[PDB]
Design a protein around this ligand. Structure first.
Ligand SMILES: Nc1ncnc2c1ncn2[C@@H]1O[C@H](COP(=O)(O)OP(=O)(O)O)[C@@H](O)[C@H]1O
Ligand SMILES: [Mg+2]
Lengths: 584, 446, 454
């Protein structure tokens, strides 16, 4: 009803007067073009507006209209296998409507398809008392994901009318007899992205996620509902790590958010994923994948919207009972958007110009992930695993974004530029990296493998830690200065890195390694050190062990390529290697 | 009445008799009630920050009432066994506590001459502490950790195994979680229940996604409860706070809200005062039965000892307990490095009548032998490690057995002071009697 | 229509403040008529109430405040695009420099352009044979890619760029790249190098030049790339030409961007450069690739000199976060007579996998690259050991790799600035280098390829 009047336009920041009836965090349309924007500040009749589109050609005197509703997302069928932008606008539909290969402004389109017919299957009986979270029916959206129609929050009553049939997301499918009267539900619900979806309670993420990455699943594991960060210099392999996880994970659904990165990387995912196969089900990856894209040359403020759009959708399928993995690539561009807006509002700068509430914004995001008990009488269980990339300037991890992140996340996959320039991928620094789940996962892995696996990993890091300490002495003196005991430790430490840690993602077989395979592969590596340590203790020379076990190494260094269904070949080596030394 | 709503902040006009850090109450246009706290107040207006945030607040149709009082704690003996918020609100689905009275969370400043000598021994059950860096009643002994280091388990192990021998009259443990994740918070709350340590403890849990003003009020809330149990109820109170780094970071946000120019390394200039105001709420007091003992826990950014947070803390606390990344990567639990660690009051809690008469000497013996054994290992790596002294060779094997058997006891292993000292002798029994710094009358323990 | 204002408030360096205006839009192009009749143009940086803050491209030198007017043209800075641009040389603001006729423009396009819909994008697949082994094999360039060159002051990045534009070609029917050149704050001699090279090869007749030199205004350097990219996308997506864009120096663009941000007293980021340095460069480099259903493309090869030869500097660092790889030149290789002096260890191409293999280049492309790279990295580590310690400290296996890296730089990377190697010659040369290494140590090449080739 009340029409605002622009008095200032500076970048993505727009101020307007006569906005006394407006509210904080409400959406408003700015200028004659009516571009999408959000109110972030209010000073009497003057409001400060954060615009998620280009503000070029917009000046003072132009009108501004409030919508009265916060930044929200449409939640329902027609959301999977789709690519939306920062504020959840269908990019494929945007291309059709505007008849353009480029991105225009001031064009409002519904997030989902409001004309497409879906088959709703009523599974609840009429006369049932329900509340928020309860399932009333479902739609087989994909072969992987069964879209469960849940009772929206703020709705409680008795199911009067419901039946199966072909409906759209606008058609009333169920009638609820509430207190305020009669209410009709649809297959679609709205929800504000800045507010985390309510649950019954949070739980501890104790089930480790199978990433198929040796360095990750072994030494720095992340659990279903965990939170991991991947800081590193450019070209270190953040996008690849997140891509590998997005295509080999143990979870049910994957949400990949391209936050301020390359457009081609988003195009690449759309093209290749339908050709690949889901580990869990056996169908195509795109049937469990939701893509959110706001590139680096796209509106800066929309980078923040892209993050909250992704986590909200993740929470949506979480309440259905699914395990969702959300990828933030990368969270640094999110921080840059906040820094830009902070400067526009003339706030007090923190470290490197970032807002002093940066660490709090990050905390809000990561605390929305985790294993929870969803609302509803069923008390079903869902989870959200957050895998975020950090892009520090110059590779310096003492930067504001990385440091604030490591205070709330539990897993730190630090990428080393020196390893990347050694063709050592993934470039994860085993010395500086860590995982707070390593102990708990270890006991889980012990029980699920029925071996002393936790002792193997502990032994594994003890060697690598010793190697770093030894390399300081190796830096000064030659190769014939260390003891046979010291020399053995270095030869088996080099094995861990080359045979196990290094993993090519572009190799059909090496791109994935099952939990079963990681066990047998690591055992033949540690058996080498043990049987050789016993040899040294009884008089055998280090050199004599080297030239005498050449052919045995070749089998171990080749073990990362052996087919999953032919795992016996790796296990057999353990007998052979011990017998190869037993030959002398 | 509301003039401006800028982010989490708010500008309220028509303020009169409004004091600093006074609580407010907001009645929104839809009937939702939220509370806040005055961060800055003038004649015409006042700046407040809402606990529940400012999202969805209509500036025109919202009202604000001032409560005329700051944050208060409803203290009572019924606090024992209860888990609270960072604001002192019940977090454990239990009955609301009928308060004996309401107290300020800022407390009072202890007179420098009103303090007593630290006297009694506190058995943490951890050999690296009780023996080499002994915790004493009234002492401020902090733990310096880092990102990824198991200070979580160490905090849980101390709060679980800590006991006073032999006098077991009114010993309590006040635990304060500051701006940590829910996982770490749930880990603590679950461990206190499963072990039964909840029956004698008080908890104040503050989360990472809680507003920065709640994170700042958390240590003041816990210490007020502690000093209540200590001074008014004569209880022996041990206080554990983590993470103190989160507290310092929270100050930066509020300081920026008041538009204050940051000091060294980005922190407010009055950081020194704030930490000292919290930590010095401890020590034995002349003419008072109960006391407050503190174990502040903090993570050093980038493992930097020169960082303001651990550097200022050392100027306040009597020593420190260092956790290193090297020992953690080696599998040492707890990863306590005894060389850079220190307890400045350990001699006040050892000797005879407390622990055992062979406490001090073996400590100096284990320390000297571990340092020398640690150095002998360095020579081995660079030299042949084959022609080193026969006595030196034992030192190397001693230093290894000292880290893997003595320091690495486990996160769920409780050692009595006697068991700790006995194991120390079995380690010192590796070396000949000619290489000891213990007296000849210490041949009763061999 | 619109009108001129004699209400200029202040002139401070590159910035102008106008008062009592109306209808002024953000980023609107303006004109400044001085008292001597001279005309300078600029764009709106910030507008509020009755005021407007603009940047002046040519500067505010010699401007009298009381007798000068300002025109608001009612539209952002545009470029008159035509197919008659080909063979013409323009200055930093897109105006004729070659003393030729005025171009009769087909239309006017906002030089900021628009962002390509990620769905509408066509992924770069087509291998570009530059003829340079260090690129074609290890850091492969693909049609539609943004692959910059990271250089330094005194390093032959001009020769390298000139060689590529002279030798770049796809293996399919089309052998036609339209070159859009953008000179940004470079010297006359550096400008003349490209001019003479384009003239002798005849590339000048099929190219478009946007020349902003060191004697030219620095603020014009902010509009110059957008001027070129708008022309590039026009000739590619509306005329169907395969456009090759060469830009230098990119560092000068950031310095100009830093001048404006300093004059506007904005809060700096790392080393005084703006917080939006990443995003601003992104609006330039993202402007590349292919589009579904459309022939022609835009291929960018930006050039920047790394300050203090430091890669961690904001300008090369943020560029690496934006572009799809980088070709780095170093002084250590330039002093060793390596042409081109490409250090492949920090070099990268993020689109090489799906541009090579079987059907494109040859089946052994990926394997030989990874094997040569690893062995080269190992040899360089061995040479460093031979520097700090003696030659005696090196093992027999260390001397072999050390000699490998030495011959790898001399015979493989060092090919010359006028020699055009085919992809087959490169891959064959790669096997002759791997032959120096023991077969047992080739742990990145399967026996299938290892038996078939030497
Ligand atoms: N796990 C991996 N396996 C094989 N190659 C990798 C791996 N990680 C990174 N790379 C290589 O390194 C380059 C960097 O990839 P990317 O993830 O885009 O870097 P960034 O860290 O900037 O996201 C890629 O082009 C890829 O070829
Ligand atoms: Mg990336």
């Amino acid at each position: 009803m009340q029409i605002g009047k622009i008095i200032k336009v500076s970048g993505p920041l727009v101020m307007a007067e006569n906005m006394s009836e407006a509210c904080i965090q409400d959406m408003c349309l700015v200028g004659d073009l009516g571009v999408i924007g959000e109110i972030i500040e209010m000073r009497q009749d003057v409001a400060s507006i954060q615009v998620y589109e280009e503000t070029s050609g917009i000046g003072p005197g132009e009108p501004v209209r409030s919508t009265g509703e916060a930044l929200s997302v449409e939640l329902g069928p027609g959301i999977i296998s789709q690519m939306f932008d920062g504020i959840q606008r269908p990019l494929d539909t945007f291309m059709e409507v505007t008849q353009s290969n480029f991105l225009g402004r001031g064009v409002q389109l519904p997030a989902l398809d409001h004309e497409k017919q879906w088959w709703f299957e009523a599974t609840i009986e009429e006369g049932t008392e329900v509340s928020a979270g309860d399932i009333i029916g479902y739609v087989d959206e994909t072969k992987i994901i069964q879209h469960k129609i849940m009772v929206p929050n703020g709705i409680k009553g008795t199911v009067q009318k419901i039946e199966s049939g072909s409906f759209t997301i606008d058609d009333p499918i169920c009638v609820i007899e509430t207190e305020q009267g009669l209410k009709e539900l649809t297959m679609m619900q709205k929800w504000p992205v800045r507010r985390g979806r309510p649950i019954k309670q949070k739980l501890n993420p104790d089930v480790p996620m199978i990433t198929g990455q040796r360095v990750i699943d072994t030494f720095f594991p992340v659990t279903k509902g965990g939170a991991a960060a991947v800081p590193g210099p450019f070209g270190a392999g953040k996008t690849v790590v997140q891509h590998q996880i997005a295509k080999w994970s143990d979870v049910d659904l994957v949400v990949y958010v391209g936050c301020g990165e390359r457009g081609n990387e988003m195009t690449d995912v759309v093209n290749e994923f339908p050709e690949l196969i889901d580990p869990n089900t056996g169908e195509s990856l795109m049937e469990r994948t939701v893509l959110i894209a706001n590139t680096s040359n796209m509106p800066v403020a929309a980078r923040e919207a892209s993050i909250y759009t992704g986590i909200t959708i993740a929470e949506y399928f979480r309440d259905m009972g699914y395990d969702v993995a959300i990828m933030a690539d990368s969270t640094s561009r999110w921080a840059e958007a906040l820094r830009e807006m902070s400067g526009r509002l003339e706030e007090m700068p923190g470290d490197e110009g970032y807002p002093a509430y940066l660490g709090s914004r990050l905390a809000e995001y990561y605390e929305r992930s985790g294993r929870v008990i969803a609302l509803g009488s069923d008390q079903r269980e869902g989870s959200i695993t957050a895998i975020s990339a950090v892009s520090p300037s110059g590779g310096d991890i003492s930067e504001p974004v990385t440091q604030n992140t490591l205070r709330v996340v539990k897993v730190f996959w630090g990428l080393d530029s020196s390893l990347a320039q050694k063709r050592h991928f993934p470039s994860i620094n085993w010395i500086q990296s860590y995982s707070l789940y390593s102990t708990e996962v270890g006991r889980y892995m012990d029980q699920i493998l029925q071996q002393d696996w936790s002792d193997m990993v502990t032994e594994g890091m003890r060697i690598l830690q010793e190697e770093e300490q030894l390399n300081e002495i190796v830096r000064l003196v030659g190769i014939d200065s260390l003891s046979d005991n010291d020399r053995l430790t270095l030869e088996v430490a080099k094995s861990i890195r080359e045979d196990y840690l290094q993993q090519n993602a572009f190799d059909d077989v090496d791109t994935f390694t099952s939990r079963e395979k990681q066990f047998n592969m690591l055992k033949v590596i540690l058996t080498f050190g043990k049987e050789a340590r016993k040899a040294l203790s009884l008089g055998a020379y280090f050199n004599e062990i080297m030239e005498g076990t050449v052919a045995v190494r070749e089998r171990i260094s080749r073990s990362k390529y052996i087919p999953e269904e032919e795992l016996a070949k790796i296990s057999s080596i353990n007998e052979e290697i011990k017998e190869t030394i037993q030959l002398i | 009445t509301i003039k401006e709503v800028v982010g989490p902040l708010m500008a309220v006009e028509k303020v009169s008799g409004v004091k600093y850090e006074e609580l407010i109450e907001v009645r929104m246009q839809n009937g939702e009630i939220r509370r806040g706290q005055v961060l800055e107040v003038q004649e015409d207006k006042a700046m407040v920050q809402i606990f529940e945030g400012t999202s969805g607040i209509c500036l025109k149709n919202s009202s604000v009432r001032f409560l005329g009082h700051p944050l208060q704690l409803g203290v009572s003996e019924d606090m024992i066994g209860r888990v609270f918020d960072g604001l002192g609100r019940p977090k454990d689905n239990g009955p609301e506590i009928l308060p004996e009275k309401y107290l300020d969370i800022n407390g009072e400043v202890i007179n420098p001459i009103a303090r007593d000598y630290p006297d009694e021994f506190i058995q943490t059950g951890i050999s690296a502490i009780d023996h080499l860096n002994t915790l004493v009643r009234g002492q401020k002994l902090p733990v310096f950790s880092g990102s990824g280091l198991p200070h979580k388990e160490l905090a849980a192990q101390i709060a679980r195994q800590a006991t006073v021998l032999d006098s077991s009259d009114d010993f309590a443990v006040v635990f304060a979680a500051i701006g940590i994740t829910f996982e770490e918070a749930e880990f603590f709350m679950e461990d206190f229940r499963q072990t039964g340590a909840i029956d004698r403890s008080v908890m104040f849990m503050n989360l990472a996604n809680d507003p920065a003003i709640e994170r700042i009020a958390t240590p003041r809330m816990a210490l007020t409860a502690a000093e209540y149990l200590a001074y008014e109820k004569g209880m022996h109170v041990l206080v554990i706070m983590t993470d103190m780094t989160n507290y310092a970071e929270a100050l930066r946000e509020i300081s920026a809200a008041r538009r204050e120019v940051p000091g060294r390394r980005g922190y407010p200039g009055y950081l020194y005062t704030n930490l000292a105001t919290l930590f010095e709420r401890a020590g034995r007091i002349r003419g008072l039965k109960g006391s407050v003992t503190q174990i502040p826990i903090l993570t050093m950014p980038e493992d930097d000892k020169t960082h303001p947070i651990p550097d200022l803390t050392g100027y306040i606390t009597e020593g420190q307990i260092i956790l290193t990344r090297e020992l953690y990567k080696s599998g040492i639990q707890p990863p306590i490095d005894v060389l850079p660690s220190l307890s400045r009051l350990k001699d006040k809690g050892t000797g005879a009548g407390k622990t055992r008469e062979d406490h001090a000497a073996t400590m100096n013996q284990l320390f000297a032998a571990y340092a020398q054994g640690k150095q002998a290992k360095e020579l081995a790596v660079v030299l042949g490690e084959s022609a080193l002294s026969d006595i030196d060779k034992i030192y190397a094997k001693f230093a290894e057995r000292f880290e893997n058997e003595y320091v690495n006891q486990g996160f769920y292993t409780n050692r009595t002071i006697t068991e700790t000292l006995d194991l120390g002798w079995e380690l010192l029994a590796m070396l000949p009697r000619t290489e000891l710094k213990r007296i000849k009358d210490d041949l009763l323990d061999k």
